[PDB]
Write a protein that binds this ligand. Structure first.
Ligand SMILES: OC[C@@H](O)[C@H](O)[C@@H](O)CO
Ligand SMILES: OC[C@@H](O)[C@H](O)[C@@H](O)CO
Ligand SMILES: OC[C@@H](O)[C@H](O)[C@@H](O)CO
Ligand SMILES: OC[C@@H](O)[C@H](O)[C@@H](O)CO
Ligand SMILES: [Mn+2]
Ligand SMILES: [Mn+2]
Ligand SMILES: [Mn+2]
Ligand SMILES: [Mn+2]
Lengths: 393, 393, 393, 393
């Protein structure tokens, strides 16, 4: 292992600072001072730190307090060298956001949320973040008649397009990244998956600077393939940031260390981020952000062990995924299964629909029964990836 | 109840004709003659019938046979009055489609699938279908390294855009509707949910004539809100057709009668199709297609009981959903919860981001703690819908 | 439908008393005085109230404090006539319980946890409660190597048999009801389903007084059929108590009002509690206890609305289910489908294995293809059930 | 890693013999001759072969046919030395079994099904099998009013105790292993999890010879922790057999190769089979049986590849898991986390309930806040396990 700043491992303040309250209990750890957080994180080899406005600045802090806090915070950044690549707003903890921020049924709460957001964009630019994340965790319902579903999407669009237009208007060098989540804390959250989020951005006025911020555990809560989803975001060139962690199944969001959930899936996620696509195409070159929570049963030694482990797991997987693809036997297996064959167009240069239709060999004269005999050998190909993952090859 | 042709209840040939083979067994029913199907369906009050090419015409039938079959089939349509509103292709049963049609790793199979599709478009136009459905049931993988995820989406796009361009080129009065499915028969299917499908259409050249064909059970297999998903398709004006059925949970696709799965969700699905949105907007005016399978334990009396029941359940729900919304007490409850309030824009006519920012009452001077006291009364509102569903009000 | 004490509707102090804090937010409601809980629930028609030791008596309460609290609570009970049918212990909220009470890896904690249970038995006995519920919410793990699994079950057995022995020695008429849950708050909980709880009970030294407390939502979080699980608990004569609420799929425990989740399943559970088994069998006679949470979006008006909605949902389902079995057409359908035929023993009176293999009629010349022709007509029985539920019958 | 007969790797005839038909397609491979299955598996290192009565002997086979088939199979066994450790009955493929075998609503069917079982016991005994597996795949329902649930369990009990009584009377050394599954092919199956199977066994007249046959994928289809379920089966001394395969989430049963689904869970199951419980306890000694399906995309080369991959995955996991417990650092971490402390009984030798409530140290003056400070360090133990799995340690 041994992570270093050019690896671009970013961590949020709320991850290592998460104190332990869950639905059945109180915190098991004391609050983490943000200056300690920065120093500690930098010592471990992180590249940057991210935060939610209220992570650093209390909801009711006065203007004198906000500047006191920011002064010590900027100093620590300075002393250590951590950058601040992404900033986000808390539109979910305070009781006022019980029906949402942007999609609250109450008009006065929608304006308050939007004004909280606009102000936070200002702080984002001041910090030097390139990405502004929006997780609409309270946007949704428990009951189907609680909302007008068309109006909920018009109100979501108005807040995002207002925020986007503000970025363009002030000339900030910022992008917005929406973060899909299927449920928890709402029964049903709006824009529940990568596809929903991707679809939605296409209906925006300011779509051009809006992308996604997918989270491993969030797609796994719907039973989806995390690599399939990021592949699709990447293919559309909407993968602006990423949140890595672990999830063992369809249940509450667990927020384990990356690699402590679906291990084989993390392997392939790493292969896609590092190696890209077999035939060439898009690559994700942003930060590798870890959005997790250290288990409540463990003390602060566990908090820093857990932070260390996110980075270890990613470097271990990266190493095995480079060896995997570099292997002559894998490449050969790949060729046999048709991975490079999928890269060739179906139609010949210049062939029209008409042409293919009327080409006897592709249809009328085709031997479907002979084509059906092919051994794709996907089982052997899968076996080679696991032996590579197991450190056996 | 009593369904009648202006209700626009369509049924596929493979639903009532499904003979019973599942993974652990053989058919329990004899094959259903398609001419019987048409007559029977028409007697029950259906408006139309839909089919897959091989539902009617055998994969290896000769040209003399295809015309014999079509002749008797058109005659029955004539004798009864059923229309043929949608036609689709089978790109999944034959062993040649074991790795997909359009996204097969084998180039020769991709061409064969595409040529099967183009020919079937011709038959669609001849029949008078307005909709051409594409369910990519074999497109996906069991293993993550089996495919180049970027190349799988380029090949999906090439077949759909080739088919679309052919429709435009021949001037057919047809639309394509993609049908998302999360898994089964593949471990992971590409374009697994409504959002994924919606996102994908935005990357097409011929996007304008491409929409979706969502299926109740398919979104419920990912644990998603079926009404939330169709709301989003409708809002984007991509809801070109719909497949209704029942699903009891995250498991294999059960294909029960509509209403025999998540009852409350079917209620709200019916409310959206019939009533639309509370504040006004888009409406879905196409056919109400039932894509289900009669339980294998039951004989042919059960097949026609099951067909009858799809229509009964929809009319029962429709009736309760009209009463629900028409109710003065519901309207009042709706007002209290802010359903109409969500319909008002957040920003005042002419207000800019700048303006709202600097409006003291929406932020600096806002009383978050007082705004947080509001009783949304979503529980009472939910109670009124269930009493309406229960036939109590 | 108006509830009366005769109905045996019981509520937990923590249910209407639930304040609104979840994983991503703080409480939205103010604490509920116990005195007012008691009076308000008696005005609604409640039969009894239930509580956790620390719902009532703070963890740190002094002796003088405890006595005051008990004096006020016992006053309220005397004033209103409310009964206290069940009492439970809180072995999950304090940080001390982070790894469990009974199956903590730390022995001093295991000792404290059992001590806390014994003291609570006394209180339970003082209050007149018939049932003692044990829900081991922190018993389990996030990671597979965290626990010696054989030793976790011995620890659990030690605790439960100690508590049972103590009851027997003290002469108390108290029975222990164990309550399964698959996950939340731990990633995996010991004894996750009705099946695992019944099995464990059979390994106990004093299992005669140990039974189950199944919860609607809990079984549904693993995707099981709650009605099938309570039917196995009844069949074994081990259904000592029941917790009713609603869940809308495999996700975090929602704790919705009974009937606000899976409706048809709710209908069928009520049918089983009220009508019993079609061919006869044991019947459930305890409290109908609601363990739910008023959504955090609702103010106190909403709390009483939700309390009310629980009993109301139950009465509406009961009316429908009594009408359903009373219907001649439904009885006809039931006989046709073989529901009464399942009640006839397979073998003949004094027929042995040997006698049966040898019966020619049963095997050697049994006409399997002719038997396979029976139309079970389960679809039509299911349509009739649904129509009774919707009150269209 | 090269398997030897000493390993006890067993395979079902129906596993490598699975032809490829699924819900949306026909077979992709030709039928496998039994003779060749036997020889091929012996060349791979298999220990034994297992089968369903109709895997080998067709349902309609004549007497002369049966004898020929048996003569060829017994030849193969003699030639290769393969053992036949388990035999099972097919009570799910013929249409006669549409509503179940043992719990069919139709009594004549229930009689045929039991007859079919008794005859198979004889054959099982002739073959030298130790285990008789019962998987009741059609036992259950799609709809809640289809069955009298108390009567479904009595019918099940009748069948299983008749079969057990017959074994006892005949002097056969055969034990029955019941096999749970939550769903597929029925929407709900009776006795859906390890927990439900163990419970039911305790209600049996002859449960001394009745135990479990849990399957990896089956428990995971309900989202349970397979390793926790087999640990409860072991603890109760009821783990008679085991079926190993892979599942990638809550969906249709995939029947992937062991290790091709949840990897870390696979690692921990192997640890439990090979290392036993950390503080000692019963150990599993039977066949390591693989009940999987070679993906339908692969030709026969793929079939043998997959057979091989099963034993290989198992050997790789075994090597890793033996190295993991042998590691001094891992033992250190285990002691730190209290894994050995769980093994110490909570009470002192001859300490009663009364003695414990009264110990001041245990309750009255126990310092709960000081005890709550222990760092269990479960995260670091889990990181160490994963690093052993990836062979980076
Ligand atoms: O489940 C919560 C989300 O993962 C958030 O932490 C966003 O990433 C930041 O608001
Ligand atoms: O699960 C199968 C799909 O529902 C199909 O029936 C498509 O609708 C028609 O190809
Ligand atoms: O999931 C939480 C449980 O349902 C509890 O409320 C128990 O019933 C009692 O501790
Ligand atoms: O889900 C199918 C089952 O796993 C069977 O293969 C049984 O093991 C034997 O009938
Ligand atoms: Mn996140
Ligand atoms: Mn469909
Ligand atoms: Mn409960
Ligand atoms: Mn099996």
């Amino acid at each position: 292992v041994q992570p270093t700043p050019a690896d671009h491992f970013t961590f949020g303040l709320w991850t290592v600072g998460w104190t332990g309250a869950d639905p059945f209990g109180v915190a098991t750890r004391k609050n983490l001072d943000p200056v300690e957080a920065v120093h500690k994180l930098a010592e471990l080899g992180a590249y940057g730190i991210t935060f939610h406005d209220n992570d650093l600045i209390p909801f009711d802090a006065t203007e004198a307090e906000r500047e006191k806090i920011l002064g010590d915070f900027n100093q620590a950044l300075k002393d250590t060298g951590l950058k601040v690549p992404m900033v986000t707003t808390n539109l979910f903890s305070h009781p006022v956001f019980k029906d949402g921020g942007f999609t609250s049924n109450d008009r006065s709460i929608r304006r308050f949320a939007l004004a909280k957001v606009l102000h936070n964009i200002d702080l984002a630019a001041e910090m030097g973040a390139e990405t502004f994340v929006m997780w609409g965790g309270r946007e949704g319902s428990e009951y189907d008649g609680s909302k007008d579903l068309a109006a909920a999407l018009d109100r979501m669009r108005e807040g995002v397009d207002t925020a986007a237009g503000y970025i363009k208007d002030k000339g900030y060098n910022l992008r917005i990244a929406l973060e899909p989540k299927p449920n928890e804390p709402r029964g049903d959250i709006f824009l529940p998956t990568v596809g929903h989020g991707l679809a939605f951005i296409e209906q925006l006025e300011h779509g051009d600077i809006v992308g996604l911020n997918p989270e491993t555990g969030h797609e796994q809560m719907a039973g989806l393939n995390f690599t399939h989803g990021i592949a699709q975001a990447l293919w559309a060139e909407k993968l602006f940031h990423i949140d890595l962690n672990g999830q063992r199944g369809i249940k509450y969001d667990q927020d384990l260390v990356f690699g402590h959930g679906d291990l084989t899936s993390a392997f392939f996620t790493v292969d896609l981020l590092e190696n890209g696509f077999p035939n060439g195409g898009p690559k994700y070159t942003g930060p590798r952000h870890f959005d997790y929570k250290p288990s409540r049963t463990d003390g602060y030694d566990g908090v820093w062990d857990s932070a260390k482990a996110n980075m270890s797991m990613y470097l271990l997987l990266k190493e095995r995924a480079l060896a995997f693809r570099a292997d002559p036997e894998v490449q050969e297996a790949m060729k046999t299964s048709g991975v490079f064959e999928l890269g060739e167009t179906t139609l010949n240069a210049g062939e029209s629909a008409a042409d293919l239709m009327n080409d006897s060999a592709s249809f009328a004269g085709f031997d479907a029964e002979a084509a059906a005999e092919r051994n794709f050998a996907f089982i052997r190909l899968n076996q080679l990836a696991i032996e590579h993952l197991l450190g056996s090859r």
